[PDB]
């Protein structure tokens, strides 16, 4: 089975009233559903006795309540280990202090397991359901560490990693000196964090920072420590600041990964992609970096190795739009569609950005017959469009001279939450009323303008004053005339005076043609009366046209004389 | 027992006693009559005694662009909510107690002389 293009994603309720009709509701409907699940889990864990009857065979461990409270109330080492597994930072510290004051021996493995908890969360309690730098100067972690009687390599390593995680870059480098003075050897994970601190500790020129890092890497070779993927990924992530200076050094890291035997992940290329994608002219370098990166990734199935693997596709598509290369965009999307690579697209914000840049590049550089196939395959099945993509789609229909689809784009626009977007309704009306069309099309454009008119009339800002742009009124009126709904067009002329919007020259001339056909002198004067209010120069010439074209009654002649008096 | 409970419609049909030999021949008269009340009228889904604030049910889901978390009203803040609901209940009762009194006829208990308004509009858009 393949994706159903007429449906919204499977997570939503398949019901016309409950299906999301916009990108905002797509995000909010899932958050409301997750909120309901959290409220259920909150109750399940708060009142576990109601949910303890197990009638399932085989047993389902994942449908039983969770118990987050320690059940050992004795003061001993085996009771501390329980509070460390539950990740009780305060209880574990209190239990560790009392245990220490009593004079009982606490093992080293356990003392380290307490630092791993404090050093990771920063002496703060992890988030629960319901009851700048963050390396607190007064922190239990540093205290317990000092009081510690015997300190092994692992004790320092967890202190150095915790400091860097919480942005205490300067303290972590100072602690890295003691480890060396004590003839100890750190691990790769400690070195990964120290590379992050070397770059972020102080602001200096690239050459200074690039000389320290190479010293850390050489130290890692002296200590017989082998670098992992995150070692190289941290270097490339940290070189993002220097941009142009780090472009060639960054490519030296990539070539080193290949030789050593570490395999670049999606994150490894995301960092290189972002490093080379600096504001400027991308053609000079970014062109051949993305073309070579995709030839390497062609036909490769990916596995999660780095936390930043879900950012490559969003980054790669962003450059394809910048370069305006549709062949490359298909290769990026082709890579996303091989095997299970589609799961690396990222969160909802990254999924909507990826498809916006991808589709907006299709509408621009792709044939309109294929553009409308992607429009059907992606929307709403893959993502809900932003109002700027509906505009990019209309601009593509205009360039292709296929305007019979405009009424469909408006129908879909409403179903995607763009009923009350001003930039969109103006764009639709301007294209429809730009030029005259055969009677069949003109009638269709007047049924759409009518529905747009209703949208302007029933805006949610109707509580406040209604904003009727000048272009919108002129276009909606012109479309009614060209369709033969003159009765509706004549009624709208009042709205030019009510809102004080200048009538367009074309609208006034076409109104005369509808009058000369109906041979109604009063209406023709009503037109000259309108243009006279705004003091348009064409009016004085139009009054001459009205005289000859239409029979002027004495009252009408005096009325024109009154406007002539104004002239 | 939870399983012995019934719906409101069943409970009101029983309590009101509108079907029966009493109501068949008007064998029972009603100076005091049980009156049906809709008890779900002013009730909000998600609102309970404990005063929990469920994001997406009884409070907004997002606040300041971020998803709200489970919260509970303070004991003082919850008393006000309860008091406000009781006053809203007496106000609603006061709105039903305020009924516009119609003019009487030839006598206070007589129907004679009372206006019934204009006759109903006929099927073919006829009016009176």
């Amino acid at each position: 089975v393949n994706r159903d293009t007429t449906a919204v994603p499977y997570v939503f309720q398949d019901d016309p009233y409950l299906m999301p009709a916009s990108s905002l509701e797509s995000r909010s409907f899932l958050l409301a559903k997750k909120s309901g699940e959290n409220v259920a889990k909150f109750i399940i864990n708060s009142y576990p006795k109601y949910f303890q009857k197990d009638i399932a065979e085989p047993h389902i461990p994942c449908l039983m309540p969770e118990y987050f409270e320690p059940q050992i109330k004795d003061i001993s080492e085996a009771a501390l280990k329980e509070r460390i597994e539950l990740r009780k930072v305060k209880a574990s510290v209190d239990m560790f202090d009392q245990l220490l004051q009593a004079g009982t021996t606490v093992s080293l493995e356990t003392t380290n397991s307490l630092l791993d908890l404090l050093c990771y969360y920063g002496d703060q309690e992890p988030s629960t359901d319901y009851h700048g730098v963050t390396w607190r100067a007064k922190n239990n972690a540093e205290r317990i560490f000092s009081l510690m009687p015997e300190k092994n390599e692992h004790s320092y390593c967890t202190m150095i990693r915790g400091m860097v995680k919480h942005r205490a870059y300067e303290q972590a480098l100072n602690l890295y000196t003691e480890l060396l003075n004590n003839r100890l050897h750190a691990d790769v994970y400690t070195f990964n964090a120290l590379i992050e601190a070397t770059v972020c500790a102080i602001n200096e020129k690239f050459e200074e920072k690039w000389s320290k890092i190479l010293e850390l890497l050489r130290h890692m070779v002296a200590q017989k420590v082998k670098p992992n993927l995150q070692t190289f990924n941290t270097i490339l992530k940290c070189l993002r600041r220097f941009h142009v200076f780090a472009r060639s050094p960054a490519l030296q890291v990539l070539r080193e990964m290949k030789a050593i035997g570490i395999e670049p992940s999606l994150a490894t290329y995301h960092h290189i992609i972002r490093l080379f994608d600096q504001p400027g002219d991308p053609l000079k370098r970014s062109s051949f970096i993305i073309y070579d990166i995709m030839n390497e990734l062609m036909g490769k199935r990916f596995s999660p190795k780095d936390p930043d693997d879900d950012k490559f596709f969003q980054s790669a598509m962003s450059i394809c739009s910048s370069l305006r290369d549709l062949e490359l965009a298909y290769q990026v999307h082709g890579l996303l569609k091989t095997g299970d690579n589609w799961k690396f697209i990222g969160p909802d914000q990254h999924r909507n950005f990826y498809y916006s840049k991808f589709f907006d590049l299709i509408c621009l550089m792709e044939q309109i017959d294929v553009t409308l196939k992607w429009y059907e395959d992606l929307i709403p099945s893959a993502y809900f469009p932003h109002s700027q993509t509906m505009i990019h789609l209309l601009q593509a229909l205009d360039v292709a001279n296929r305007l019979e689809v405009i009424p469909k784009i408006w129908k879909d626009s409403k179903e995607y939450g763009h009923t009350f977007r001003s930039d969109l309704r103006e764009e639709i009306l301007m294209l429809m009323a730009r030029d005259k069309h055969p009677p069949e099309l003109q009638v269709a454009f007047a049924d759409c303008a009518a529905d747009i008119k209703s949208a302007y009339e029933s805006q949610p800002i109707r509580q406040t004053a209604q904003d009727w742009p000048a272009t919108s009124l002129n276009c909606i009126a012109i479309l009614f005339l060209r369709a033969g709904r003159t009765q509706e067009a004549w009624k709208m002329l009042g709205l030019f005076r009510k809102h004080n919007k200048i009538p367009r020259s074309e609208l006034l001339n076409e109104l005369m043609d509808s009058a000369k056909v109906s041979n109604s002198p009063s209406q023709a004067i009503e037109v000259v009366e309108l243009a006279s209010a705004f003091s348009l120069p064409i009016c004085e010439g139009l009054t001459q046209r009205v005289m000859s074209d239409f029979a002027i009654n004495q009252e009408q002649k005096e009325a024109l004389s009154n406007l002539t008096a104004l002239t | 027992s939870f399983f012995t409970k019934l719906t409101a419609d069943e409970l009101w049909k029983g309590a009101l006693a509108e079907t029966g030999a009493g109501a068949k021949k008007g064998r029972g008269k009603r100076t005091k009559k049980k009156k049906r009340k809709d008890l779900n009228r002013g009730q909000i889904i998600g609102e309970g005694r404990y005063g929990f604030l469920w994001p997406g049910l009884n409070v907004p889901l997002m606040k300041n662009g971020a998803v709200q978390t489970i919260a509970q009203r303070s004991k003082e803040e919850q008393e006000k909510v309860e008091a406000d609901m009781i006053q809203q209940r007496e106000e609603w009762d006061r709105k039903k107690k305020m009924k516009v009194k119609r003019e009487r006829g030839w006598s206070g208990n007589s129907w004679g002389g009372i206006s019934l308004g204009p006759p109903d509009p006929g099927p073919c858009g006829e009016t009176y």
Binding site: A21, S22, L24, E25, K414, E415, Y416, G417, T419, F420, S458, P460 | K95, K96, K99, V100, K101, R102, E103, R104, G108, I114
Partner: peptide, 15 residues
């Protein structure tokens, strides 16, 4: 009887 006289727009994706 005498005591008391007895006692629209739909749009997609509304916010």
């Amino acid at each position: 009887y005498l005591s008391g006289e007895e006692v629209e727009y739909e749009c997609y994706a509304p916010d």
